[PDB]
Amino acid sequence: DIQVQVNIDDNGKNFDYTYTVTTESELQKVLNELMDYIKKQGAKRVRISITARTKKEAEKFAAILIKVFAELGYNDINVTFDGDTVTVEGQL
């Protein structure tokens, strides 16, 4: 299935959120939800990796995560694909 790994680091405080969705609908729920946790924490570095079923899927997700990070002010983003896992890491 779809594995969402959210890792927020911020001086002596590391948060690791792991979700498993199946809807792309309840994904919008996780998405929206993560957007808030991060707005609040306002961390320098934020990493999100999503293990998709196919690389073409990982791409659609990378497009999603890019807009998420951009909107939230993270503007120097690294997008890395590792098989079916996409890892978008941004810095504020």
Side-chain angles (χ1 to χ4, degrees), residues 1-12 14 16-24 26-27 30-31 33 35-43 46-52 54-59 61-70 72-92:
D1 258 320
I2 302 161
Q3 187 61 181
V4 183
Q5 248 296 59
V6 180
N7 221 85
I8 306 177
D9 218 301
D10 192 37
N11 319 73
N14 185 51
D16 188 64
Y17 300 96
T18 317
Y19 309 68
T20 314
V21 297
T22 293
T23 332
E24 180 164 54
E26 71 178 331
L27 198 197
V30 174
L31 280 191
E33 172 179 344
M35 286 191 92
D36 298 309
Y37 289 124
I38 88 96
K39 273 176 183 173
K40 182 178 180 59
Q41 238 295 294
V46 163
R47 197 206 322 158
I48 302 190
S49 53
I50 289 171
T51 294
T54 60
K55 167 148 176 174
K56 295 208 70 65
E57 175 172 56
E59 294 172 1
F61 285 153
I64 282 181
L65 297 182
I66 271 176
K67 307 186 180 178
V68 164
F69 275 100
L72 312 185
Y74 290 76
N75 303 309
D76 182 57
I77 310 166
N78 285 134
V79 172
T80 296
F81 297 84
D82 199 306
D84 275 337
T85 295
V86 67
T87 308
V88 184
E89 175 216 285
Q91 271 166 296
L92 214 40

